[PDB]
Amino acid sequence: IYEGQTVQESELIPQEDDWVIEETNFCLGRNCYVRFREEDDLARRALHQMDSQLNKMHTRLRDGTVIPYMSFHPDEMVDRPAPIHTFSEKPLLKWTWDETYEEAYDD
Amino acid sequence: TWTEIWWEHDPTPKVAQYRPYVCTVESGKVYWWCACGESKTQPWVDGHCKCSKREGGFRPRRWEPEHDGVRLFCGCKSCFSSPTWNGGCFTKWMQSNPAGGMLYCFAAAFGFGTLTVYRKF
Amino acid sequence: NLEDHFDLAEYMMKMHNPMSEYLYWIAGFVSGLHGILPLLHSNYYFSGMFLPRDNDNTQLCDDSW
Amino acid sequence: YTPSFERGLNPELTSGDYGDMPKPQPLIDFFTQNRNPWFGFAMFCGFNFLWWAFFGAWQIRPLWASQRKSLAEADRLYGPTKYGVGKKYIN
Amino acid sequence: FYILVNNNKRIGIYYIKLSIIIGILGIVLSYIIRVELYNSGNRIIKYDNVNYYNMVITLHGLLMIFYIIMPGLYGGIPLYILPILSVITDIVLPRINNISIIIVLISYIVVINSIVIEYNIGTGWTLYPPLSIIGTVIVNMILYGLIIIGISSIISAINFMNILIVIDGIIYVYIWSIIITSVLLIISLPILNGILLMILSDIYFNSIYFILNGDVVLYQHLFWYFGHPEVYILILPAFGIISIILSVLNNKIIFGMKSMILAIIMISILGSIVWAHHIYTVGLELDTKIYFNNLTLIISIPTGNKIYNWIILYIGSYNILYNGYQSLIFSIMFIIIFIIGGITGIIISIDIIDIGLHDTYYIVSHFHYILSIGAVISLLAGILLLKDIIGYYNVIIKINKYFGLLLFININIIFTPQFIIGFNVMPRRILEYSDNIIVWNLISSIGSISTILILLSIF
Amino acid sequence: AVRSQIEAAVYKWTRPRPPRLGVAVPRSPPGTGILFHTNMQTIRYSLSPKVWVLVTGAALVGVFSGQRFAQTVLLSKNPPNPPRYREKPPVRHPHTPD
Amino acid sequence: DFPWRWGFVAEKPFWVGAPILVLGVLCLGHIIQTMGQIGVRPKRYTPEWVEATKERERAENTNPITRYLDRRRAERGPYYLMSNVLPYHPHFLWMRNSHDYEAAEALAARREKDRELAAKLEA
Amino acid sequence: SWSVPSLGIKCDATPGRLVKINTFIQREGVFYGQCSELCGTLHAFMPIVVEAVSPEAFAAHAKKW
Amino acid sequence: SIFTPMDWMFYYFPNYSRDKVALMARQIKIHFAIGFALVFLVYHPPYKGADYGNFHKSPLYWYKYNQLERSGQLQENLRIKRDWFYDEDP
Amino acid sequence: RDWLIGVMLGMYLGNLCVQQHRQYRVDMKLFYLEAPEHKINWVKPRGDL
Amino acid sequence: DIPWPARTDWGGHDPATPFAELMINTHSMFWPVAIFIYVSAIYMVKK
Ligand SMILES: CCCCCCCCCCCCCCCCCC(=O)OC[C@H](COP(=O)([O-])OCC(O)COP(=O)([O-])OC[C@@H](COC(=O)CCCCCCCCCCCCCCCCC)OC(=O)CCCCCCCCCCCCCCCCC)OC(=O)CCCCCCCCCCCCCCCCC
Ligand SMILES: CCCCCCCCCCCCCCCCCC(=O)OC[C@H](COP(=O)([O-])OCC(O)COP(=O)([O-])OC[C@@H](COC(=O)CCCCCCCCCCCCCCCCC)OC(=O)CCCCCCCCCCCCCCCCC)OC(=O)CCCCCCCCCCCCCCCCC
Ligand SMILES: CCCCCCCCCCCCCCCCCC(=O)OC[C@H](COP(=O)([O-])OCC(O)COP(=O)([O-])OC[C@@H](COC(=O)CCCCCCCCCCCCCCCCC)OC(=O)CCCCCCCCCCCCCCCCC)OC(=O)CCCCCCCCCCCCCCCCC
Ligand SMILES: CCCCCCCCCCCCCCCCCC(=O)OC[C@H](COP(=O)([O-])OCC(O)COP(=O)([O-])OC[C@@H](COC(=O)CCCCCCCCCCCCCCCCC)OC(=O)CCCCCCCCCCCCCCCCC)OC(=O)CCCCCCCCCCCCCCCCC
Ligand SMILES: CCCCCCCCCCCCCCCCCC(=O)OC[C@H](COP(=O)([O-])OCC(O)COP(=O)([O-])OC[C@@H](COC(=O)CCCCCCCCCCCCCCCCC)OC(=O)CCCCCCCCCCCCCCCCC)OC(=O)CCCCCCCCCCCCCCCCC
Ligand code: HEA
Ligand code: HEA
Ligand code: CUA
Ligand SMILES: [O-][O-]
Ligand SMILES: [Cu+2]
Ligand SMILES: [K+]
Ligand SMILES: [Mg+2]
Ligand SMILES: [Zn+2]
Ligand SMILES: [Zn+2]
């Protein structure tokens, strides 16, 4: 069964005595029904909807990396509402292994 | 007992009261709940406790009611549904005074057994 | 085109003509009538009344109404 | 209804200046919801549905008094003989 | 276009839309029944028109199963998200997907037209001969609908099985539920078609299979060989939805994924060999009855494992997250309701207990708790979970605690009394009844009128 | 007076010992204090095994002790059934044709 | 963003509105179904017919085990039956003064004939 | 289907099957039942009434009828 | 294995359970034989199991039987409490 | 561990129905032997109407 | 024998044959198990 990543004792040693877990808010903000503008026509309302996607949002950490919106299933990865053609580029399921080949490295 | 014997890196509160605090709350207003048990305006942060000063990992707990009414608020500072009360105050008391917990649970169980048996029989 | 990105773009962008919704509700209403109208027609055909009076097939008191 | 100020088990922890924040109250207020008459009406209400769900509607009994009496007489005069506490029940 | 569209997501919407439309007729038929059963004596159906009541129950059962719940759970949600849950773009067989929904509509039009034009008589949704083969042409029309519906079901099953070839990700639990349901259709549908043809042969080709020296019980075996897999075909997609909702809304990985998958597989295998618990009262051999009774109880073992795995998904979830969302409430309500329906199923699995409870309203309540509450609520829960993806609006259902509470209270009022009535005893498929069963029937009737009113509040 | 002595005795005996972890985790570096905050998702407060048993055991005694109390005090035993005497049945069924 | 009906309902506390709605919906359902049977007075629910059923039950000794079990349960503890307190038919509202006078005369005549037969049987 | 709930009997009356049911009545009485298989227009109007009497009473009744 | 958590099987019998695929097959085969054996060895055998004179009496049976036999309860329990229908009316 | 509470709660509530069934069987054994509700030579055939 | 108003009759009522008693006893035998299954599961439906 999965019980999280394994941690070694040395990995828990801080480089400063004042380090504490970062208090970054992972609440993306306050939302409601997407509110369109009467002036926007069909094309521009589509742009408005595409700019309100929660799955395009993320939280930036203190080192510049971002933790994105993540889901257990790919149903939450398409634009909401679902467009006619969703996965133009095949989603990549990344597996990890310890195998390696010499061609990838250079000395 | 998570803070007491399992994990030593989370802030550990002081029990203000082993009973919930009853308070009237209003919809559309935000309330701040003391998570250290040292505020003098319980169950709310007073501006001088650890939560107000952001000391030792203690921070105020934001809360907002959906509707107006009277709600129960945790005094033990460890209820699972904190700031709201769900009975954890009694549970945490039994940990501190297990002999007392036996008396209450026996009495409560005794009443439940009598009523249920009397009606069904 | 941007207009074609979303399926049923007019409805999803909240510009659709309300008549589409009315037809959907009307279609549902007509479907419901297929249970009520034949009931009335069949009752009249075999009895001559659209609907019975409650307990009219049983013996009733003199003052029953 | 201008509820009272319950100091609590430790009065020192309720001794500060509350400002506009609400002050703790007696536990009876929670059960009455500050004597909201509609909570009390919705309360009287709660007991009626419960009663109907487990015992039936006993609000129809005043109208059923006369016809229940006739049923009781019929059982006693013509129904099968009851014994002991069984006489208390009429079908 | 509107009819020429092959997009699977559009077709998924059409399945949901069509099920709601047909649902109204099913609800109307259901409402006609409870109004009539309010008290002894005719209320809305003449004594001289009792044949109509038999048609109402026959259509109520048929429409709700084949035209409402099955398209909703097996055609609607799967066609929308299944290609998305898989990493593929669209359904494998786009043109077949289009014709399947059109076929469902045409069969519906044939059925309702038969109500209007043909004489109205009924033989139950199970169409037991010889009663089914001595009836009027309305029975012929209903057979055409079922056969036509069978074509759509099988081709849709073929469509989903092809996902195994093209799936570019992991087979999630939900995908397994649809795949195994397709397998059940593939193995059970051809048997159904064969026996239905025999019914047509007797009705229309002067066949003598269902007259003396021809065993009428032969039909019951072949029908229920498909009949029980059908109920498991209805519910298995509901299980898949519950697994997704509970995991997603609690931010918890599905526990025992392989146990869940194997439970679904086990149920299908067992569900295909227990059909004869519908035939306890016909007088089967002693050893035959013992076998089916024993294997029927075994179905609870895999079904129980899924229940417990669901419970641990909800346990321990973060308190800060708001738990009043309608989708979450419905998913939790399903566990509570399904357990009631399943436990009563185990009670009526014991054949000696079933002797008293066969053809009684206890059986009605059994399958209503599972289907009318559980399956509907699962379908509602799934649609609510996908509200943002689907994009429908103009309803107040996402956060509506009144609707959830009122629905739960009132549906329980309809069907809990029917358990009690079963021991009293009141037979099924009956219009009149003895005066001493009125109280319980009256309470359920009040429940039925109340539920219909609640539906108007969502708009 | 006696209550205080028994209360102290149970309190001392029930103080939990450190758990025997059934999971592989590292040792926290020495001198590491509080690193998280109180806005973390609340972790349920669970009783220690000894306290849970004592409290749970008391409830079991209570519920069954209450059951015995009801059966012996609140409820009553059936008296012997009334004697069965030979009675006259009705002369005719009320629907017998005359 | 919501119509008046929802803005009104959603403003109140859930446990204030919810119990009222549950009772209100049930009351409306009962009222709606009672509309079609105002003043309907079947003879089988009149006092005369009720007595005749009791006579039949005595002759047929109907449900002797329930009557025995009810007595046994009552002797042991608190036993409450809905049938004891509640009406068994919905037409009780209109049948306060309803009677079948033809049955009354016939039932009285049969009872008189039965008394004669009983005396003859005693011999 | 021939159902008499008090006697614990519910046996389907199927054409072509002469099913056998055995019973032993312990107390006198009249036991009511109803057909328990949908059979047509008047499925609800074919009740089953069985009256159990003393063996001496039955012998006299059988001889007379 | 029967009624056995397979984690115990993995731990205490590593070599035997080294091939998991083969282990799964044995699990199916073993339980298939049990089901087959029950029908033909427990249910089927004709004209057997009717020796009602040889009812098994476990030690718990004798403990309770002797306890009641020592007192008068066993005699009182077996006594027929009533053998007449009507009571005499005084 | 908490699940054990549900097991104990289910066992107790289940045991309530065991006691009711236990008393029911005792009552039934006394019906044909002692209960005056049980009557013989009582029901007479009605005859055809 | 005959249905009576507002009766639960849980498991059956008024047996007249030894087989009828068997049907009622079988249901009563399993009824407490059914309660145990329901109560044990439902008690854990919570966060
Ligand atoms: C002292 C009190 C009495 C004790 C009695 C003891 C009995 C023996 C049990 C073993 C000993 C227990 C001792 C525990 C010591 C404490 C240990 C501990 O760790 O404590 C801290 C620990 C956790 O502390 P914490 O972490 O700080 O959090 C504390 C919080 O308070 C959070 O607490 P929580 O989350 O644990 O909350 C528990 C809650 C959680 O529960 C839920 O969340 C439930 C959610 C779903 C609700 C579903 C509702 C029902 C749906 C019905 C469907 C149909 C609808 C019909 C509608 C009709 C129209 C209206 O559980 C319940 O509500 C109980 C549900 C039980 C099943 C209900 C169904 C009963 C059916 C019975 C058969 C019916 C047959 C009918 C026959 C005919 C009529 C008679 O707390 C506990 O352990 C608390 C335990 C208390 C449980 C009491 C439950 C009593 C229920 C009685 C039911 C009676 C039924 C009567 C009818 C019977 C007929 C046959
Ligand atoms: C179970 C219930 C409770 C459910 C609760 C839970 C629900 C949860 C939510 C579920 C949501 C699922 C997902 C939803 C996704 C929606 C996507 C969407 O909107 O797609 C866009 C789609 C189309 O939008 P669009 O893209 O703008 O389309 C543009 C058109 O393609 C092009 O525009 P156009 O204007 O060119 O259109 C052409 C138009 C041309 O229009 C016109 O020319 C109209 C002229 C006016 C006609 C009006 C009707 C007149 C009727 C007269 C009756 C007289 C009776 C006299 C009686 C006398 C008695 C004495 O029509 C036609 O030419 C063909 C019409 C054929 C279809 C309509 C058939 C009507 C019934 C016919 C019955 C015939 C019976 C014969 C029987 C004879 C037997 C022998 O929307 C719709 O189609 C409407 C959908 C509305 C519902 C949306 C969902 C809302 C949430 C649910 C609400 C509750 C519903 C409850 C059921 C209904 C209850 C009644
Ligand atoms: C039969 C009487 C009928 C009376 C009429 C009906 C009156 C209305 C009652 C409405 C109650 C609603 C309660 C809230 C929903 C429950 C959700 C929940 O549990 O989560 C809360 C909370 C979870 O955290 P949260 O986030 O704060 O809550 C989320 C809410 O869901 C968020 O939901 P929200 O946004 O809607 O906010 C709701 C909020 C605000 O809630 C309210 O506004 C409700 C305030 C309490 C009102 C209670 C009035 C009781 C009146 C009784 C009258 C009796 C006499 C009747 C006539 C008899 C004639 C013979 O709730 C709270 O603040 C939670 C408070 C904890 C639950 C308290 C429930 C029990 C109240 C006491 C009942 C006493 C009944 C005695 C019966 C005696 C019969 C002779 O913690 C728990 O789960 C609480 C654990 C359970 C504690 C209470 C234990 C039961 C009380 C003692 C036994 C009483 C029965 C004795 C029988 C004796 C017979 C001889
Ligand atoms: C060797 C021998 C040789 C012999 C040679 C002999 C040859 C014989 C030939 C035999 C074959 C004849 C037929 C050939 C068909 C050709 C197809 C083709 O190529 O079409 C291209 C052609 C392209 O059209 P276009 O010329 O480019 O113009 C199209 C428009 O400009 C705009 O484009 P569009 O496609 O968007 O517009 C179409 C659509 C646009 O309008 C809309 O869609 C309106 C907006 C939607 C409103 C909401 C509707 C409700 C929601 C439905 C959800 C599920 C939808 C499922 C998918 C659609 C299924 C139809 O409106 C309609 O067509 C009507 C839509 C009807 C929707 C029905 C939904 C369910 C209704 C439930 C009724 C409940 C009441 C029960 C009682 C009544 C029962 C009937 O196809 C069409 O668009 C028209 C198709 C029309 C034929 C439909 C025939 C249906 C027959 C049904 C069975 C009736 C029998 C029983 C009668 C009972 C009466 C009571
Ligand atoms: C004395 C006699 C001795 C006889 C000896 C005979 C020896 C025969 C040797 C047979 C060896 C088979 C070798 C091939 C293995 C399968 C490989 C495979 O399919 O490759 C994927 C391949 C696609 O290639 P791919 O790109 O590698 O796929 C990537 C994955 O999609 C991406 O997925 P992923 O990477 O996330 O996961 C990988 C894997 C994930 O799944 C697995 O790895 C599953 C592994 C277990 C499979 C079962 C093995 C057998 C277990 C023992 C059973 C013993 C029973 C003994 C009973 C004895 C009674 C006397 O995915 C799949 O396997 C997908 C296909 C699953 C199809 C399942 C269809 C339902 C069958 C029932 C399920 C099995 C239940 C077993 C029992 C459970 C209870 C204990 O699939 C296809 O080509 C799909 C074709 C679809 C055709 C459907 C229409 C067929 C006609 C249907 C007729 C009616 C059928 C009725 C069935 C009833 C069922 C209850
Ligand atoms: C979705 C629909 C659905 C589902 C899932 C089920 C599921 C089950 N059904 Fe049901 N059934 C129907 C729909 C359904 N049924 C219909 C429609 C009829 C009537 C058809 C007609 O006559 O017209 C019917 C009829 C029916 C009959 C009577 C047939 C007759 O004689 O008329 C029986 C008898 O055993 C039965 C049994 C079962 C069982 C044992 C399950 C099991 O799958 C249930 C298993 C679930 C549980 C047991 C609860 C969960 C498990 C636990 C909580 C823990 C483990 C529990 C135990 C070990 C007891 N069903
Ligand atoms: C899915 C199947 C389904 C559903 C939902 C229902 C729903 C209901 N059914 Fe049932 N019913 C059957 C299938 C179903 N039924 C079957 C198969 C039979 C046996 C047939 C026979 O006897 O041969 C039967 C029999 C049956 C009888 C017995 C008839 C008789 O023997 O005389 C009765 C009596 O009241 C009844 C009542 C009801 C009621 C009051 C509702 C509902 O009102 C309950 C509450 C539901 C609502 C208020 C509507 C909710 C909305 C939907 C269900 C649609 C949702 C659609 C989408 C989400 C797309 N049903
Ligand atoms: Cu005969 Cu029904
Ligand atoms: O069918 O269960
Ligand atoms: Cu089945
Ligand atoms: K009626
Ligand atoms: Mg049948
Ligand atoms: Zn503080
Ligand atoms: Zn607390």
The CA distance from F4 to B96, in Å, is 14
**What's the 3-state SS for E175-223?**
HHHHHHHHHHHHHHHHHHHHHHHHHHHHHHCCCCCCCCCCCCHHHHHHH
Cβ of A54: how many Cβ atoms within 10 Å? 12
**Active site annotation includes E90:** yes
CA B68 to centroid of chain Cα atoms: 21
Q: What are phi and psi of D31, to 5 degrees?
A: -75, -30
Question: Is-contact C61 G100, C-beta < 8 A?
Answer: yes
Determine which residue's CA is closest to atom 2 belonging to ligand 9: E228
Is E428 among the residues known to form the active site? Answer: yes
How far apart are alpha carbons B75 and B21 in whole angstroms? 6
Q: Which of F18, F49, J1, E319 is nearest to B95 (CA)?
A: F49
State chain F's maximal CA–CA distance in angstroms: 106
* DSSP structure class, residue B84: B
Tell me the chain B residues in contact with residue G12 when contact means C-beta distances shorter than 8 Å. 67
Q: Residue A37 to residues A42, A52, C2: CA-CA distances in angstroms?
A: 11, 14, 17
Query: Residue F29, preceding bond cis, omega within 30 degrees?
Result: no
Backbone angles phi, psi at C56, to 5 degrees: -75, -15
Nearest CA in chain I to F83: I87
* Cα-based distances in Å from K16 to F70, H6, K1: 34, 6, 8
Instruction: Check: CB of residue K32 under 8 Å from CB of residue J15.
Output: yes
- Could you give the CA distance from residue D73 to residue D71 in angstroms, rounded to a whole number? 5
Pocket of ligand 2 (CB under 6 A): C 8, 10-11, 16-17, 19-21, 23-30; E 2, 13, 16, 20, 23-24, 116, 383, 390, 392, 394-395, 455, 458-459
Establish whether residue F52 lines the binding site of ligand 1, counting it when its CB lies within 6 angstroms of any ligand atom: yes
CA-nearest residue to J24 within chain G is G69
Among candidates E392, C29, G39, B119, which has minimal Cα distance to A82?
E392
Show the tokens assigned to G36: 């079609």
- Check E19, E114, E132, E153 and give the catalytic one: E153
Q: What does the alpha-carbon distance between residue G118 and residue E288 come to, in Å, rounded to a whole number?
A: 56
Distance CA B114, CA F68 (A): 8
Query: Whole-angstrom distance between the N-terminal and C-terminal Cα of chain K?
Result: 49
Query: How long a stretch of residues is chain K?
Result: 47
Checking DSSP bridges between strand A66-68 and strand H29-34, what pairing results, if any?
unpaired
Q: Which of G68, G120, E357, H17 lies closest to J29, judged by CA?
A: G68
Helix, strand, coil fractions of chain K, as percent rounded to 5? 55, 0, 45
- Per the DSSP assignment, residues forming a β-bridge with A60 are A66
Q: Which element (helix H / strand E) includes E161?
A: helix E137-161
Contacts of G97 (CB under 8 A, 6+ apart): none
> What whole-number distance in Å separates Cα of residue H5 and Cα of residue H29?
13
Contact (CB, 8 A) for H5 and K12 = yes
Cβ contacts of E66 within 8 Å, gap of 6 or more: E146, E149
Both structure tokens of E55: 């048609």
Q: Which residues contact E218 (CB under 8 A, 6 or more apart)?
A: E209
Q: Which two tokens stand for residue D82?
A: 């009851």
- Between chains, do D60 and G50 touch, taking CB under 8 Å as contact? no
If DSSP codes are grouped into helix, strand and coil, which group holds residue A15?
Answer: coil
C-alpha–C-alpha distance, residues E249 and E381, integer Å: 12
Tell me the CA distances in angstroms from G52 to E39, E50, K3, one per residue in order. Answer: 21, 30, 17
Contacts of E10 in chain C (CB under 8 A): 7-8
Q: What is the dihedral of CA G102, G106, G108, G112, to 10 degrees?
A: 160
Any catalytic annotation for residue E224?
no
Which is catalytic among the residues E34, E277, E289, E358? E277
Q: Using alpha carbons, select from E331, A72, F47 the residue that is nearest to residue J1.
A: F47
Q: How many CA atoms lie within 13 A of F12 on its CB side?
A: 6
- Taken as a whole, chain E contains a residue count of 459
* CA triple A4-A6-A10, angle to 5 deg: 135
Whether residue F10 contacts residue B101, with contact meaning beta carbons closer than 8 Å, is answered with no
Residues 6+ apart with CB under 8 A from E107: E67, E144, E145, E146, E148, E149, E152
Closest by CA to E120, choosing from E146, E138, E143, is: E138
Q: How many whole angstroms from E245 Cα to the centroid of ligand 9? A: 26
D38–chain G Cβ distance below 8 A for any pair: yes
Strands H29-34 and H47-52: antiparallel
Judged by CB atoms closer than 8 Å, whether chains meet at B121 and J19 is answered as yes
- Distance CA(B90)–CA(B95), nearest Å, equals 9
Catalytic annotation on E259?
Answer: no
CB E279 within 8 A of CB E293: no
Helix boundaries (H) for chain B? 50-53, 88-96, 98-120
Nearest partner of E242 among A78, K45, B80, judged by Cα: K45
- D-G CB pairs within 8 A amount to 103
Phi-psi region of I19 (alpha: psi -120 to 50; beta: other; left: phi over 0): beta
The token pair at D20 is 């506009």
Against chain F, the chains showing at least 3 CB pairs within 8 Å are A, B, D, E, G, I, J
Burial of A96 (0-12, 13-18, 19+ CB in 10 A): exposed
Q: Parallel, antiparallel, or unpaired for β A58-60 and B21-25?
A: unpaired
Distance of CA F17 to the CA centre of its chain: 25
Burial of F12 (0-12, 13-18, 19+ CB in 10 A): exposed
Query: At a CB cut-off of 8 Å and minimum separation 6, what does J35 contact?
Result: F81, F84, G64, G68
* Contact assessment for residue B82 and residue B63, using Cβ atoms and an 8 Å cutoff: no
Query: Cα–Cα distances in Å, from B101 out to D38, E87, F3?
Result: 37, 55, 13
Closest CA to B11 of B45, B32, B38: B38
DSSP structural state of residue E429: S
> In angstroms, what is the C-alpha Rg of chain B?
17
K interface with H, Cβ–Cβ below 8 Å? 1-2, 12, 14-20, 22-23
Q: What's the CA gap between K12 and H3, in Å, rounded?
A: 14
> Are the C-beta atoms of residues C42 and E45 closer than 8 Å to each other?
no
Task: For residue H51, give the 3-state DSSP assignment.
Answer: strand
Residue that the structure tokens 């329990």 belong to: I77
CA dist E393 and E458 (Å) reads 11
CA distance B71 to B114: 31
Structure determined via: cryo-EM
> Which H or E run contains C33?
helix C19-47
- Over chain G, what HEC string results? CCCHHHHHHHHCCHHHHHHHHHHHHHHHHHHHHHHHHCCCCEHHHCHHHHHHHHHHHHHHCCCHHHHHHHHHHHHHCCCCCHHHHCCCCHHHHCCCCCCCHHHHHHHHHHHHHHHHHHHHHHC
Tell me chain A's radius of gyration from C-alpha atoms.
21
Q: Helical H runs in B41-97?
A: 50-53, 88-96
State the pairing for strand pair A66-68/B61-63.
Answer: unpaired
Give, in order, the Cα–Cα distances in Å from D27 to each of B71, D8, D33: 10, 11, 10
Instruction: List all residues 6 or more positions away from G3 whose beta carbon is below 8 Å from its beta carbon.
Output: none
Q: How far apart are CA I34 and CA I41, in angstroms?
A: 10
Using a CB–CB cut-off of 8 Å, the residues of I that contact F are 85-87, 89
- Give the DSSP letter of residue F42: P
The verdict on a CB contact (< 8 Å) between A81 and C1 is no
* Residue with tokens 């519920």, as numbered in its chain: F63
Identity of the residue numbered G6: W
Q: At what angle do helices E94-117 and E8-36 cross, to 10 degrees?
A: 20
Those residues whose C-beta lies under 8 Å from the C-beta of residue E454, and which sit 6 or more positions away, are E403, E406, E407, E410, G25
What H or E segment, with its residue span, contains residue B32?
strand B31-33
Query: Of B70, B21, E158, whose CA–CA distance to D36 is shortest?
Result: B70
Q: Residue D9 corresponds to which amino acid?
A: L
- F83 upstream amide cis, omega within 30 of 0: no
Burial C16-48 (b: 16+ CB within 10 A, else e): eeeeeeeeeeeebeebbebbeebbeebbeeebe
Report the 3 state secondary structure along chain I: CCCCCHHHHHHHCCCCCCCHHHHHHHHHHHHHHHHHHHHHHHHCCCCCCCCHHHCCCCHHHHHHHHHHHHCCHHHHHHCCCCCCCCCCCC
Residue E418 CA from chain centroid, whole number: 19
State how far the Cα of F66 lies from the Cα of E317, in Å rounded to an integer.
36
> Which of A72, A85, A90 lies closest to E168 in CB terms?
A90
Closest ligand to residue B15's CA: 14
G13 with B67: Cβ contact below 8 A: yes
CA dihedral G64, G68, G73, G75 (to 10 degrees): 150
Interface test with B, best of E315, E318, E320 (most B CBs within 10 A): E320
Q: Does E116 touch chain C (CB under 8 A)?
A: yes
Facing residue for B113 by CB, picked from F36, F55, F63: F63
- Phi/psi at B33 (5° precision): -105, 135
Residue E341 burial by CB count (10 A; 0-12/13-18/19+): exposed, middle or buried?
buried
**Degrees to nearest 5, angle at CA I51 with I48 and I54:** 135
Token couple for F73: 């005090």
Q: Got the DSSP string for A68-79?
A: E---SSGGGGS-
Q: Which residues of chain H from 4 to 63 reach within 8 Å of chain J, CB to CB?
A: 26-30, 51-54, 56-57, 61
C-alpha A69/C-alpha E436 separation (Å) is: 61
> Least CB-CB distance to B1: which of F34, F47, F62?
F47
Helix, strand, or coil here: D2? Answer: coil
Single-letter code of the amino acid located at C12: M
The question of whether E366 is a catalytic residue gets the answer: no
First to last CA, chain C: 70
- Residue B72 is classified by DSSP as E
Contact H28 J45 (CB under 8 A): no
F94 close to G109: Cβ distance less than 8 angstroms: no
Distance CA(E337)–CA(E347), nearest Å, equals: 16
Alpha carbons B58 and A77: distance in angstroms, whole number? 36
What's the CA angle centered on E318, arms E313 and E320, to 5 degrees? 145
Resolution in A: 2.2
DSSP states of E80-104: HHHHHHSS-SS-S-HHHHHHHHHHH
Distances (CA, A) of E377 to E241, E337, E340, E452, K39: 11, 10, 15, 15, 22
Please count the other Cβ atoms lying within 10 Å of the Cβ belonging to residue E269.
13
D50 within ligand 3 shell (Cβ under 6 A): yes
Cα–chain-centroid distance for residue E3? 27
**Residue from E10, E38, E40, E90 carrying the catalytic annotation:** E90
CA gap E112, I19 in Å, rounded: 60
Helix (H, G, I), strand (E, B) or coil at H25: coil
Q: What is the dihedral of CA B9, B14, B20, B26, to 10 degrees?
A: -70
Give the distance from residue D81's alpha carbon to the nearest chain J alpha carbon, in angstroms: 8
Q: Is G104 on the interface with C (CB under 8 A)?
A: no
Place of tokens 């950490």: A61
Q: Which structure tokens are listed for J42?
A: 């009582």
* Cα dihedral across residues E419, E425, E429, E433: positive or negative: negative
Task: Decide: E346 in ligand 9 pocket, CB within 6 A.
Answer: no
Atom of ligand 2 nearest to the CA of C32: 100
**Sign of the dihedral defined by the CA atoms of residues E199, E204, E205, E208, in that order:** positive
SS (H, E, C) E354-369: HHHHCCEHHHHHHHHH
Closest alpha carbon to E386 in E241, E224, E212, E282: E241
The strand pairing partners of B73, in sequence order, are: B21, B84
3-state DSSP call for residue B43?
A: coil
Q: Provide the chain D residues 50-89 that lie in CB contact (below 8 A) with chain F.
A: 81, 83-84
Cα of E251 from ligand 1 centre, angstroms: 26
d(CA F86, CA I89): 8
CA distances (Å), origin F82, targets D75, F25, F78, G65, I90: 20, 74, 11, 15, 14
- Please identify which of the residues E58, E268, E296, E303 carries the catalytic annotation: E303
E264 Cβ contact list (under 8 Å, min separation 6): E173, E176, E177, E180, E236, E239, E302, E306
Determine the Cα angle at B82 with ends B9 and F50, to 5°: 65
